[PDB]
Amino acid sequence: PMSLAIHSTTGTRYDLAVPPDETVEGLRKRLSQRLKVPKERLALLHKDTRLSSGKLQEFGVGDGSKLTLVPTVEAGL
Amino acid sequence: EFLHAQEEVKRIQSIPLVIGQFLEAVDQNTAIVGSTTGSNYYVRILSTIDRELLKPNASVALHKHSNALV
Amino acid sequence: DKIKENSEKIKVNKTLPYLVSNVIELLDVDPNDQEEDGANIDLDSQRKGKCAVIKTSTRQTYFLPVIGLVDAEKLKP
Amino acid sequence: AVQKVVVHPLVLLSVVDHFNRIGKVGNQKRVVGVLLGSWQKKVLDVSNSFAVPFDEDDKDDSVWFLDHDYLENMYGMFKKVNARERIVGWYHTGPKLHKNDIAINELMKRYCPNSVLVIIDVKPKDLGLPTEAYISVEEVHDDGTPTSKTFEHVTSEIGAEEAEEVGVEHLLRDIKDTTVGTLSQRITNQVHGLKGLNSKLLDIRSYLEKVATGKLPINHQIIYQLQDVFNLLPDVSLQEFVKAFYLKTNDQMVVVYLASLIRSVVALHNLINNKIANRDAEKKEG
Amino acid sequence: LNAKVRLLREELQLLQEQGSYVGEVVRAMDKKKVLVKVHPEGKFVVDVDKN
Amino acid sequence: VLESTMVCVDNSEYMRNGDFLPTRLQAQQDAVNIVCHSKTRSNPENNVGLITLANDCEVLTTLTPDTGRILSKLHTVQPKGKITFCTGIRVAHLALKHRQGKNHKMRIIAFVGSPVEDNEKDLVKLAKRLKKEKVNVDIINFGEEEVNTEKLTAFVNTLNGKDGTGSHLVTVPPGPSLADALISSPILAG
Amino acid sequence: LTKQYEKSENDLKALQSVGQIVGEVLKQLTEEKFIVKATNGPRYVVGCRRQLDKSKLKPGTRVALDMTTLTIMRYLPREVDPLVYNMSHEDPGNVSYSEIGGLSEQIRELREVIELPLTNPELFQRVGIIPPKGCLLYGPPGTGKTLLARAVASQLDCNFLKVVSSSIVDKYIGESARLIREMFNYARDHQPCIIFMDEIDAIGGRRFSEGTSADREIQRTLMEL
Amino acid sequence: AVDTAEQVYISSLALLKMLKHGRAGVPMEVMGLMLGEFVDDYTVRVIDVFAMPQSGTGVSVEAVDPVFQAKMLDMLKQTGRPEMVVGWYHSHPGFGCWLSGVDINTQQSFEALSERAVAVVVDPIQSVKGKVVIDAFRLINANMMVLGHEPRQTTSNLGHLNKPSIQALIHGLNRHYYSITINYRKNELEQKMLLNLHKKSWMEGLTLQDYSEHCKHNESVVKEMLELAKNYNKAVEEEDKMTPEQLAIKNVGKQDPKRHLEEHVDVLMTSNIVQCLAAMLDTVVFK
């Protein structure tokens, strides 16, 4: 199983081994339940390209990669 | 420091002010004013406003919620 | 299921006590020169659709950029 | 040419934190960054600024590195933010103009046809206004050199906008300001002008006695360009000049005397008003 | 001067309070009630204060 | 394996001869192409830019992780000027103090296409100053020199010396041949 | 899915929009202070955004405003007052001057008042005489005065307006002259216009003296015109 | 396991950029991410701030493609200081300087990454020249009300040094979150730079304006002072015997003597003695 590295904007790298056939949403729900956040306020960035629905191994990634976790900030009333 | 506080009270000017017409003066720094919304009021006047500028029912600006002469 | 949830959320917002009003005329807003990013606004220059101006039953005439859940071509002043 | 340049206080405050960023060694760290503004007329204004890397040696004034890729990348980035500002020039935090800066300006002149530079004193131990500005011209001389590129001065001042003025006034709460009090800060302005004139004349004397006493070549210009300074300074002990000077001094003294006379009776009015309204009140109260 | 600057700060505080509707008195009533009328709306049978 | 590979290209007067291939410029172009392809065939984190050796040492492309932009900028070099090696290697070393990744090794590869007109002592003190800060330089000879990398093999031997043995000067085969014949021994390392 | 998905997300997008208040600008106070009047009542002082081209915000223009912050949003063209909309683009098509016959003398005299000064404005200047403004038709009923107006209406269709001259009155002391204000202001905005005032004898008439307070409003509509 | 007597440091450039970006998007809410560090467990320092492209509605403002944010925070590591994203800010023009219902929604998301996440609310409308309205909020757990949120081992962040407002106490305040006290840290490099951006060099200090305009200005001021003193005569000599408590009530109109005299004294004296002093300086300094 490929163990990837997620890096936040602040930076406390939430290392988590993933299965090799987790598309986009399984990784998102795993890091959502690990990060205690709801899933819809999430965004995963890898090699300057957003992840939407593709297969993880089809998109890229090997045994270890540095993806970027960013939260969709939002304000208003 | 009083000149600093004289500028400091200008926070209540802000920008969304309604427009009224001054009517008569009652006592020091307190007078009546007629809002253009329709009703008539008895408001407080800031000390920064000079008293030279009010006489023949001139157009003035009032606060929204507090409704005082600013 | 995903679309029907959005269909459920539409009927939630339109509850029942709708105010009635009159349509004054229909407008159309052209874009401007250059809209600044980080201070841009959607309800502005970036709307090439239709628009309307509405006088309410309380004799207060308001404006709306997005006509909403009505086809614009059916509406007449 | 470009007449004069206006600097908003967001720049020249962004510069000092850039000097605090990698000025830990603090010996010859010529920090260079790239300006951002808009030449809305012949007059110019600059509002934003960002960073470019730079390393150079103490000697060997030909080895240096302006990053092309960082400049293009962060320009595209700030264009993705702000589509109004375009690059105007650069700033270096050197206290004096250097020898290799003209190569930097000639390199960066591809992005801007008239790239001004702003010398900003990070540590202005000399009194005066910081952020001087220079631009490149041709100074074809009669000596025999065809042309060179050695810059010239453009007038500069710190301007203001209606939001940054609020910030720089609120952050100025660690200093007493006597600008509101008149007839005092004008005298401090006179004192500051006298000290600046003394400092400039001291620098001129230092250079002239340096080139005078053997050291350094005698520049054939300047010594006759500063000759026309001494052809000025007209005679104070001239008859018609003194005759006009007293004629205007008396005209000013009339207004000063009438101001004192119009002040004294107001003071007396306050005095007798206080005395009457006090004594009658203590007659009632007792 | 210190009373003036303190009054200015407390004036900045107190200016946030509400206003007061003017009116004219029609007639007094029994048990300390008066009949006032505001300008746009109708009449009101209101009470008086202790001062 | 990760480093900021930095190749430099000569554009002197003497670069404009055809003792190799149609010209030395073309063989230099496929040399840089083979170097960049070997960079891409490594771990995909390495960066390649270039510095020229004209009268002014112009850094045409700052250190970048791709390869197509450098290959596009390889064209139109216009080889007019005199080759300088002191200022070129100073700006090459000073160019890599602002690396985006600080774990990358310090490698400078050079193409000397004209006889480098320099004194021995200055190149010796340059070699000492560069080898103090763990920087490794490989040089590839091209064509004529003052007795064919004389005063240069001692430079690279003092650079990788004190039982270090991290550099290897590649002497030019004195003959017109393809650039593949010039990279046969450094197909992996020099 | 199919278009039911794409219609739903645009439906949920549209609900997040809000309304905007419509007002008019009285004058320019400073470079960032603007005094406006909401048309339902009270006036305010507001500010622009940053880039609304404040030279264009002239006194008297119409402009939109936000709800909460109440700032200047976007300038708009002049109002049209949809009573005027119902009498502007409402006439169905008609066939030409062939159906009307026997009035060829009166046909040509109307053509020289209406069509000739706008089609050929140079020939009046050459003599140097201002063209006539309006004309009046009269006669016994059933001879085709309204049909003559339909013939001119379907001739170039410039900006033809059909006044019923009985909806000019209303139940209030105002709103009768105020409609005539917006009609001629609509006539000023679209320059080659034609007003048709059929059956003037309702609104018009003679001048009374202490008749009725009802006649005072009908007269107040009259001498305003 | 304790929220102590906390403190937030903000730099000068952060506040200036904060107010400029808040004013530049005046009618709606603008966005932003803060750059700083946790110097200790007690205090949090913000040394830089930056903005992003946004997309605003009438009531809401959302972000855009966040490859901007990732690449920007990657590139800012290269030049100088490589900090982290310690917080976020927005603006609330003409509002109560408070966390709204959707403002507190993303605060949970920002707090889920790091515990010491600070929200900052600025407002460029109510802010005036002498004072900028500013606030920093820290989200507290809405599940724990029975215990204490901060023990307050001292009296720093309390009714000390600041008081809670009224409109903040309506939309939230000590409910669901709390406030923290802001102080400004000023380094000497910027300290001896900030106090000198108003002066000019020596040509401004030694410059006589002109003598024709000075004579005409003095002529005009004395000319209006004539009629003003003529009004002052009648104002003094009337002085109707009835106690100023109503003489300040008949003064509230257009009446103006006794008040414009001393202002004209000031503008005459402080423009004449300065010019005469500068004339003497110019006539005997240069020689």
Ligand SMILES: Nc1ncnc2c1ncn2[C@@H]1O[C@H](COP(=O)(O)OP(=O)(O)O)[C@@H](O)[C@H]1O
């Ligand atoms: N000159 C004409 N030729 C043919 N038909 C006519 C003529 N004049 C009137 N009509 C008929 O009269 C009708 C129009 O009547 P109306 O408009 O009421 O006349 P008026 O308004 O002059 O009383 C038309 O339907 C048309 O058929």
Ligand SMILES: [Zn+2]
């Ligand atoms: Zn908000």
